[PDB]
């Protein structure tokens, strides 16, 4: 299939900015219907309803749901949409040829979107489990763990997506006869925008099949819009044959991922995995859903517990850091406890530059480096810097990424001879993991996208370190009159 | 007759000092066994033991489970409670004589508790209190869904506030049944130790209310004082005062689920029915679910609603600086020309702007002759912030306006004519209206000579608000200072 072949590269040209709203193609598990909710007349119908129902798609256009789904189901259809906003709607469930489909009702530029899934024909001790864990860490060992329990399926992972946008692997449930992913980063080239989009839309991404063809919706524009279908609010969609091939070659042919979403952002993705294709019941799909709207109310939750003690011993810090500070230069002092410094960040190597010989503590690189790197601190002005890449503003300084990558870096406002640097290296160092469209290939194209490029800082932590600069502007003046 | 009367009428004097930590009774619905923790001996036993296996409960201290629970399932016991801490515990079903206990089994003061009572939905309900847009309708829809549920009539949510007092914010009341919304019953009627063994656990049940405690034989502790720790037991003898409480009220069953937000007893999910009835294990869980899960929607909603206040809060200052620039003669008396904006800015129902003898009042406030003397007392210390729960606790005539002018805060710069921006707050008496011994009709008559003169509490933000207008009203002023060029 030497023609098939040129013509997926072609697709793999522009990825970035795709229209995946907008495909024009449903996955064949299942029949969509865009109608004029009113009278309940067909606008658009997919090609999948010849192998269940009526001869072509463009002769159902027009006509009304009184025919292709028959009497009757059509006004119940009617009533239960009558004039609701469909906001939790009951439980449907039609046959038109003996064939179950569950009915999911929305509405899509003022016209009703019928989505009807093909299906074929403990949990309060759970949360409780959620509840008693006392850190993060194990609150995400044991939702992974019951998850891959009940859920079935043979990988179950989950990503947290960084402000920077690459996923991280934080833990999973892996069974035999697969890698290992804890650990592992992907780009966040590897999800485009809208499909970040339709994940933080929703709250929950099935994709029963990754080896399929999409199936025809015809007509492609709406007669009465003449303009393309949205379907991002559709479980029934059309996957990217790039993300498809992705699974191909991730090893996984069935795939799920429940959106945690905390406060409209997409903190991160309940994945899964499997080989052997699996229909997900609507009772299960109910339950993994529900994990997603409690897990990241509890997550956030548990982070609302750890950004306030992270912040409270960041409140105590300087409180044991100012007794040293009063008990002799101000920036001399803070070099005897150097462990006291890295907790006030999380900066896994601290240096403080005073004299002639930089006095560096935990990692750091030698004193020919930082010296030729704080340089680009005070020039600027600002007191304090958030530097996920280390080079952005010193072009030529690649030979500290080894161990000195993000310079989050503080100082007196003496112009000479100041300064406290807090280097966190790159990720790549701090997690060990280890063709085409490889969880291989992105980890390796996520290094060079990585490669300069440290840990995010959090607000408070800058703000932690601006306390501790104010505080060293505090006794100053009483050091100066002393 | 009389003398039962006797009992109950010493036993009512001491309420808010009564040891219900160690009740040393338990209630009739199980059985509870106290044993060495190594050997599994029987330290202490319950007198029901003589009804529910038949052997004598004064004998059978000091010796091991086999003579009731048999070898095998002491020793299936022992594998669970022998290095687990009890964090996690499954299900422990077993049946002694052909009868079915749950066992739930804890540790107090170094000793076994066993406690043996006798004996789809859930994605939906979660999707719907997570689709809730206000507190108000969270409230609604939880209540709805309990009682749903739950088999028990009235289904209340008590929010407890931070005085100590508790309000039924919402109620699902079974249809033909007395309605208690909006109802107020003081802090006295649940004692602190029943709050700390509420906070400590996530449910209270009692299946009947007109039961007879059946007490522990030896009642003292085999080994030293204060008795068995029945505060992590489910299975714990009602006080008699409560006990009556509830028969007055008609229920006989009650459910209990401690709203905890953190560590904080943030309210009562209660369940009163009128007719005894059972829990079953399956639903004691989902109710306490449906409890952690609602907690930490309020706890996070919570959050939502008071950044949406700071929100406010913070535009409403900026927004209140474009309209105090725009005066010419007085910085406050110019904040007096939107007074609507004023009550809101800190929550508030009636807002003074005091003048020179000129108390531009605006809403519900007394004649200015009464509340001059207040403008005087707040010269009296000079705070900038006045934030008073109590009026006439704190100044002694406050009867004249005690019923509209009860929860007074205010700020003022230090200046030879002073003014005011008093935000009065009506006493919470008024703003409830609800239509013997232990009713709730004497408990809101007994929380109204309690909350006689208090209006809500005023939050920091409140008083954290009035700041920012009084650092504003120097700000302003400062600019003020130097216009006179
Ligand atoms: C610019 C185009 C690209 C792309 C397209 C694409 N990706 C997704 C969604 C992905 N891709 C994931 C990639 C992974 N990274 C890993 O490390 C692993 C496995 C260990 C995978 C699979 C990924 C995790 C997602 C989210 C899915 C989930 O369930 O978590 C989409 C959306 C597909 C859809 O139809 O929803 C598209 C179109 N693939 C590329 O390689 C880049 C170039
Ligand atoms: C000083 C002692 C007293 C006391 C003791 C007591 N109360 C409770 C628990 C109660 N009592 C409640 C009473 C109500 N007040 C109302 O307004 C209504 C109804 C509208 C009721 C029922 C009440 C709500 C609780 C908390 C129950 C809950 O929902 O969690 C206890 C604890 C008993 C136990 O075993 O749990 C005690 C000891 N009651 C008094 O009236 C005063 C004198």
């Not at 019951?146 to 990503?159: A, C, H, K, S």
């Not at 997506?161 to 692997?169: I, S």
Request: hydrophobic residues 40%; aromatic residues 6%.
């Amino acid at each position: 299939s030497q023609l098939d072949k040129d013509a997926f590269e072609v697709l793999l040209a522009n990825c970035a900015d795709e229209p995946i709203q907008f495909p024009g193609a449903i996955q064949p598990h299942g029949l969509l219907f865009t109608l004029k909710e009113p009278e309940l007349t067909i606008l658009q119908v997919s090609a999948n309803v010849q192998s269940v129902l009526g001869k072509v798609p463009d002769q159902l256009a027009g006509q009304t749901l009184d025919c292709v789904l028959g009497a009757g189901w059509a006004e119940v259809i009617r009533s239960t949409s009558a004039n609701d906003s469909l906001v939790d709607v009951p439980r449907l469930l039609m046959s038109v040829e003996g064939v179950e489909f569950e009915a999911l009702l929305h509405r899509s530029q003022e016209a009703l979107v019928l989505e009807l899934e093909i299906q074929d024909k403990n949990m309060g001790r759970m949360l409780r489990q959620l509840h008693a864990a006392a850190d993060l860490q194990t609150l995400y060992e044991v939702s992974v763990r019951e998850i891959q329990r009940m859920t079935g399926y043979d990988r179950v992972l989950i990503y947290r997506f960084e402000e920077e946008g690459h996923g991280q692997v934080i833990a999973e449930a892996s069974a035999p006869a697969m890698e290992l992913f804890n650990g592992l980063f992907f780009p966040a080239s590897d999800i485009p925008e809208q499909a970040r989009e339709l994940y933080r839309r929703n709250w929950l991404r099935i994709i029963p099949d990754a080896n399929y063809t999409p199936v025809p919706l015809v007509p492609q524009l709406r007669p009465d819009t003449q303009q393309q279908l949205d379907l991002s609010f559709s479980t029934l969609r059309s996957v990217s044959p790039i993300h498809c091939q992705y699974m191909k070659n991730m090893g996984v042919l069935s795939s799920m991922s429940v959106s945690l979403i905390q406060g409209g952002k997409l903190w991160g993705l309940i994945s899964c995995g499997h080989r052997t294709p699996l229909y997900v019941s609507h009772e299960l799909r109910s339950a993994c859903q529900a994990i997603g709207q409690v897990l990241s109310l509890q997550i956030s939750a548990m982070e609302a517990l750890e950004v306030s003690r992270q912040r409270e011993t960041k409140i105590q810090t300087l409180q044991q850091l100012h007794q040293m500070m009063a008990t002799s230069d101000v920036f001399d002092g803070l070099a005897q406890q150097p462990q006291l410094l890295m907790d006030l960040v999380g900066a896994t190597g601290v240096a403080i530059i005073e004299d002639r010989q930089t006095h560096c503590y935990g990692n750091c690189p030698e004193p020919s480096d930082i010296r030729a790197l704080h340089t680009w601190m005070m020039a600027g002005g600002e007191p304090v810097y958030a530097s996920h890449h280390l080079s952005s503003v010193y072009p030529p300084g690649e030979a500290y990424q080894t161990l000195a990558s993000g310079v989050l870096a503080m100082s007196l406002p003496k112009p000479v001879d100041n300064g406290v640097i807090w280097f966190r290296p790159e990720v790549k160092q701090s997690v060990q993991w280890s063709l085409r469209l490889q969880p291989r290939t992105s980890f390796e194209i996520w290094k060079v996208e990585m490669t300069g490029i440290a840990t995010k800082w959090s607000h408070g932590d800058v703000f932690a370190a601006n306390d501790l600069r104010r505080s060293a502007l505090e006794n100053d003046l009483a050091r100066q009159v002393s």
